[PDB]
Structure 1
Amino acid sequence: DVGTVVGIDLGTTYSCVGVFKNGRVEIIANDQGNRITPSYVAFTPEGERLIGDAAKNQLTSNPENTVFDAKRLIGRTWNDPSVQQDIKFLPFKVVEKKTKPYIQVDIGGGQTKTFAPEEISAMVLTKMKETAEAYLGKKVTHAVVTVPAYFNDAQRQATKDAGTIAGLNVMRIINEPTAAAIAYGLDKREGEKNILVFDLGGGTFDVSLLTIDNGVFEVVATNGDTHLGGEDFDQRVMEHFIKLYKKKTGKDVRKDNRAVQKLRREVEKAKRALSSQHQARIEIESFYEGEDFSETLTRAKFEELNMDLFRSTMKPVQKVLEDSDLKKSDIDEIVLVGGSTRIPKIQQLVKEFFNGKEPSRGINPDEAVAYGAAVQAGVLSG
Structure 2
Amino acid sequence: DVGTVVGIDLGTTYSCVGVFKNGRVEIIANDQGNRITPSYVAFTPEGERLIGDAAKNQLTSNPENTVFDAKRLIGRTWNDPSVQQDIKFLPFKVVEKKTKPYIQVDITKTFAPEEISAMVLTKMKETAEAYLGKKVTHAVVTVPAYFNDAQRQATKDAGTIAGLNVMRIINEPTAAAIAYGLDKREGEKNILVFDLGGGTFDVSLLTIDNGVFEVVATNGDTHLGGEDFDQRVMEHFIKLYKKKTGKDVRKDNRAVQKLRREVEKAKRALSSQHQARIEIESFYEGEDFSETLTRAKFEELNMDLFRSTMKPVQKVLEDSDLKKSDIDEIVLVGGSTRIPKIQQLVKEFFNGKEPSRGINPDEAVAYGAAVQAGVLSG
- TM interval, shorter chain, is over 0.9
Q: 1:203 aligns with which of 199, 213, 226?
A: 199
Name the CA distance, whole Å, in 2 between partners of 1:56 and 1:223.
29
CA deviation after TM superposition for structure 1 residue 96, in Å: 1.1
How big is each residue's C-alpha offset from its partner over 1:95-126, in whole Å with a ceiling of 9 and x where there is no partner?
Answer: 1112210001111xxxx111000000000000
Identity %: 100
RMSD of Structure 2 on Structure 1 (CA): 0.7
Name the CA distance, whole Å, in 1 between partners of 2:190 and 2:11.
25
CA deviation after TM superposition for structure 1 residue 381, in Å: 1.2
CA deviation after TM superposition for structure 1 residue 37, in Å: 0.2
Name the CA distance, whole Å, in 1 between partners of 2:3 and 2:336.
34
Name the CA distance, whole Å, in 2 between partners of 1:325 and 1:136.
45
CA deviation after TM superposition for structure 1 residue 33, in Å: 1.1
CA deviation after TM superposition for structure 1 residue 81, in Å: 1.1
Q: What 5-or-longer segments of structure 1 have no aligned partner?
A: none
Q: Secondary structure at the match of 1:222?
A: strand
How big is each residue's C-alpha offset from its partner over 1:215-240, in whole Å with a ceiling of 9 and x where there is no partner?
Answer: 00000000000000000000000001
CA deviation after TM superposition for structure 1 residue 180, in Å: 0.1
How big is each residue's C-alpha offset from its partner over 1:81-103, in whole Å with a ceiling of 9 and x where there is no partner?
Answer: 11011011111111111221000
Q: Secondary structure at the match of 1:340?
A: helix
Q: Secondary structure at the match of 2:60?
A: coil
CA deviation after TM superposition for structure 1 residue 365, in Å: 0.1
How big is each residue's C-alpha offset from its partner over 1:289-343, in whole Å with a ceiling of 9 and x where there is no partner?
Answer: 1000001111111111001100000000000000111100111110000111010
Give the equivalent residue in structure 1 for 2:24: 24
> In the alignment, is residue 89 of structure 1 matched against residue 85 of structure 2?
no
Give the equivalent residue in structure 2 for 1:286: 282
Name the CA distance, whole Å, in 1 between partners of 2:325 and 2:88.
42
CA deviation after TM superposition for structure 1 residue 189, in Å: 2.1
Name the CA distance, whole Å, in 2 between partners of 1:267 and 1:164.
37
How big is each residue's C-alpha offset from its partner over 1:36-78, in whole Å with a ceiling of 9 and x where there is no partner?
Answer: 0000000111011100000010001101111000000000001
How big is each residue's C-alpha offset from its partner over 1:223-280, in whole Å with a ceiling of 9 and x where there is no partner?
Answer: 0000000000000000010111111111111110100010001000110011111111
Q: Secondary structure at the match of 1:188?
A: coil
Query: How many positions carry a matched residue from both structures?
Result: 378
Name the CA distance, whole Å, in 2 between partners of 1:188 and 1:129.
28
Name the CA distance, whole Å, in 2 between partners of 1:249 and 1:141.
55
Name the CA distance, whole Å, in 2 between partners of 1:338 and 1:98.
35
Name the CA distance, whole Å, in 1 between partners of 2:224 and 2:302.
12
Name the CA distance, whole Å, in 1 between partners of 2:53 and 2:132.
21
Q: More displaced, 28-37 or 145-154?
A: 28-37
CA deviation after TM superposition for structure 1 residue 362, in Å: 1.2
CA deviation after TM superposition for structure 1 residue 361, in Å: 3.0
CA deviation after TM superposition for structure 1 residue 357, in Å: 0.4
Name the CA distance, whole Å, in 2 between partners of 1:361 and 1:50.
32
Q: Give the TM-score taking structure 2 as reference length.
A: 0.99
Name the CA distance, whole Å, in 1 between partners of 2:300 and 2:92.
33
Name the CA distance, whole Å, in 2 between partners of 1:360 and 1:253.
41
Name the CA distance, whole Å, in 2 between partners of 1:361 and 1:31.
26
Give the equivalent residue in structure 2 for 1:33: 33
Q: Secondary structure at the match of 1:187?
A: coil
How big is each residue's C-alpha offset from its partner over 1:110-147, in whole Å with a ceiling of 9 and x where there is no partner?
Answer: xx111000000000000000100111111100001000
Name the CA distance, whole Å, in 1 between partners of 2:69 and 2:316.
26
Name the CA distance, whole Å, in 2 between partners of 1:343 and 1:361.
12
How big is each residue's C-alpha offset from its partner over 1:128-183, in whole Å with a ceiling of 9 and x where there is no partner?
Answer: 00100111111100001000000000000000000000000000000000000000
Q: Secondary structure at the match of 1:30?
A: coil
How big is each residue's C-alpha offset from its partner over 1:176-203, in whole Å with a ceiling of 9 and x where there is no partner?
Answer: 0000000000112221110000000100
List structure 1 runs of 4+ shifted beyond 4 angstroms: none
Name the CA distance, whole Å, in 2 between partners of 1:9 and 1:16.
5
Name the CA distance, whole Å, in 2 between partners of 1:100 and 1:123.
19
Q: Secondary structure at the match of 1:79?
A: coil
CA deviation after TM superposition for structure 1 residue 378, in Å: 1.1
Q: More displaced, 67-76 or 355-364?
A: 355-364
Name the CA distance, whole Å, in 2 between partners of 1:59 and 1:97.
30
Q: Secondary structure at the match of 2:183?
A: helix
Q: Secondary structure at the match of 1:239?
A: helix
Name the CA distance, whole Å, in 2 between partners of 1:104 and 1:173.
28
Name the CA distance, whole Å, in 2 between partners of 1:219 and 1:91.
34
Name the CA distance, whole Å, in 2 between partners of 1:259 and 1:20.
42
Name the CA distance, whole Å, in 2 between partners of 1:95 and 1:130.
30
Q: What 5-or-longer segments of structure 2 have no aligned partner?
A: none
Name the CA distance, whole Å, in 2 between partners of 1:360 and 1:20.
22
